[PDB]
Write a protein that binds this DNA or RNA. Sequence first.
DNA 1: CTGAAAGCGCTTACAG
DNA 2: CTGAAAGCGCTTACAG
Lengths: 332, 332, 84, 84
Amino acid sequence: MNVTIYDVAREASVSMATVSRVVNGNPNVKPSTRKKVLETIERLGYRPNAVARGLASKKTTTVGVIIPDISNIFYAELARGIEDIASMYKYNIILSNSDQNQDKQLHLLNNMLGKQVDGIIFMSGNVTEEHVEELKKSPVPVVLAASIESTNQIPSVTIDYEQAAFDAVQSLIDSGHKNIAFVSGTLEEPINHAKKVKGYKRALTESGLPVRDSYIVEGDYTYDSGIEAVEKLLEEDEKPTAIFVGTDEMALGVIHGAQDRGLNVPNDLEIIGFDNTRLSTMVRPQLTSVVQPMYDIGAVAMRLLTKYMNKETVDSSIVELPHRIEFRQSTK
Amino acid sequence: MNVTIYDVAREASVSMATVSRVVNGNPNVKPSTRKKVLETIERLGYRPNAVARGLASKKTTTVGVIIPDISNIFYAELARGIEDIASMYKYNIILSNSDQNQDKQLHLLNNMLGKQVDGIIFMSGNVTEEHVEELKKSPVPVVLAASIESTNQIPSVTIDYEQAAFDAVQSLIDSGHKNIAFVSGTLEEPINHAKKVKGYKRALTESGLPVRDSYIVEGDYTYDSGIEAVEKLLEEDEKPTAIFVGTDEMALGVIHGAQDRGLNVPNDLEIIGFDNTRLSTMVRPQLTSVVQPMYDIGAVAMRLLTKYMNKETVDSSIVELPHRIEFRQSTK
Amino acid sequence: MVQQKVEVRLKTGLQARPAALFVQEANRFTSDIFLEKDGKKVNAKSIMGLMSLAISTGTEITLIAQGEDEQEALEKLAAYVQEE
Amino acid sequence: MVQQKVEVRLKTGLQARPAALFVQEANRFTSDIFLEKDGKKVNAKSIMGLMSLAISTGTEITLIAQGEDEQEALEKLAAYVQEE
DNA sequence: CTGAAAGCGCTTACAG
DNA sequence: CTGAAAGCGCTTACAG
């Protein structure tokens, strides 16, 4: 603030352009004089001005993250991963919540973009055609996380939500279960009606089981939204022998819905969730869930992004980590 | 990047100093010419450079938050609150994790400080004498969150962890319970051995009950760390009739520890947790917990901080929101 | 100056983000707005204040509005806190 | 070039932050380091690679180290993944 | 209302 | 290795 690169040029009897060379660290100075410069720095408390460096270097060492809601354990981990890999590449971060709505996103976007970010990790449950054609001309590199967008005109690390759903809904089938419903989140989120539902129905039809509109009910994403659906199933003639859920909490609120109706899990019904949240092992019975490595999805998207700003070699802009299933006390 | 305030000075036939007046919005320009300026801006796509404005205004419109670990639901909410109140005052944010260790904190600190933040919300489980005397001379305003630091030389919004513990440990007492243990987190965190434990023991001694070192056991902060402690209590002669826990998860892992040992909650033991996490209502039985308004603690600390940068009137630098208790299926 | 005593059918009450939304909602009105709670009243367009009361479910509170849009304001605020 | 086949007594395995720590741990060695998994091997100082294998508990994997501190490296890495 | 000028702290090419 | 100079895009006081 008061001690500049100028005042080091003073106490160092060197040139302002010298002082810069030492801080940034570019080899090419007299070590004999170099240290002459590293002394004053420690001696004066000279903290370089990241801003002054920004205007002149045309780079900031900062990525901006647009994330739905940092208060949900789900996006939480995702955030850490991004934060970590970034803190590892000496890249600082700018975070904010998009509340999932559009006119707030494009805003955060265009904003950060003016803050001069050197990059952007962006994740939303809805990547409207608009945003794509918007991100596409961003002056700085972009990379999506946990997000789905059909064209693939933008680099993105994501997992195969369809297989995920499929490979789980099948688990049920191989266990004889021929009447398994699916408790889903907002059906409008393409990462549901275009990935999970199809992955769900792909498993039924593929093995020759029905596909009626009485096994796939909607509802919000929290605990409660799961207590409802359950009720709707027992109180119906297509007795659901088991259920697939696109969120752990939801499931957790379905396990309960049923025990309150006196039924026993799994003797009366096996239930498999989605995400494998630390919350998963928290329930009783223990919830078997579809693993979605969020910490990894975030770490990769950032790491990938750094491998763009620094202009390294990308071999694929469609990265997909794998998945599994953690069988527990909710299934045979 | 290519369209500057200069190029608007061009297409607007106005002065560079004119163009600035309009963007920042300071009344004092010819509305007739003002609009002449707002047109080119929309017409050219002129996105101002937040950096150039930063070097010249000596203000950035950004606070930096130092937070322990953004992956724990606890700090999660805390983050949202800070993020919200900030996004409300048009103030951008910079987040990072201190992993709770010191040489990483002072680093994040001194770093952000060089990034030129206009302020800092800082929360850690340990505010060593060092950091204080360090924060104290920060060139920009600081404010602590959920954090404890005895001297009070730094503005901070916090709740009364002692009362909290007291007013909860008493609940037990009025329910006859005279043998209640306390499952605590890292005892070394002043926000435990200097706030909760005393608040715990203040309740015993005050009502004339004992205070033996066989009711207050340590253990990590997660689910598992709670399964242990429980075991240590049943398998002991000072039969714990109930237990107080400094974290919900921990408790949640104690409720279980006991049912697995066949005992019944609460007939065999009432248990009250701490934080009142959304995870609280997730358990079965439902966990009665000490309410600690994190979303509020964060929103206040930021809001307070804004009411410092803008140099408004502060009436207290020791803000404390209140607390309560959410009785549920874990107590009579 | 328009006044009204209201319940708060909110589940979280006036805390957490709901609270925070209440305040932003309040600012969509030019009318100085206020919220009284069992005696202490604070500015309802201020996060500091509103959050210091920690108004939980079941509590009844008087809300005050004085300005061009006091009816409009009040209409909305009470409405919001009504959960309904 | 020093080699070793190891289990991975880790509870989360080589995923989540543990994974991420493994990589930072790997970089404290000048020795080019690698990790083989059932056939595919990636750079162990690279987050991209290590995370694409998604190595969970119970899996045995060969780790390779070639450099001034290959023993030192290996000693530590295998050690880490050993949970023990 | 409103130009012209100087200055924010660093860097980046350009001559030694 | 290494100075001197110009320039990053905006703002801030200073004269109209």
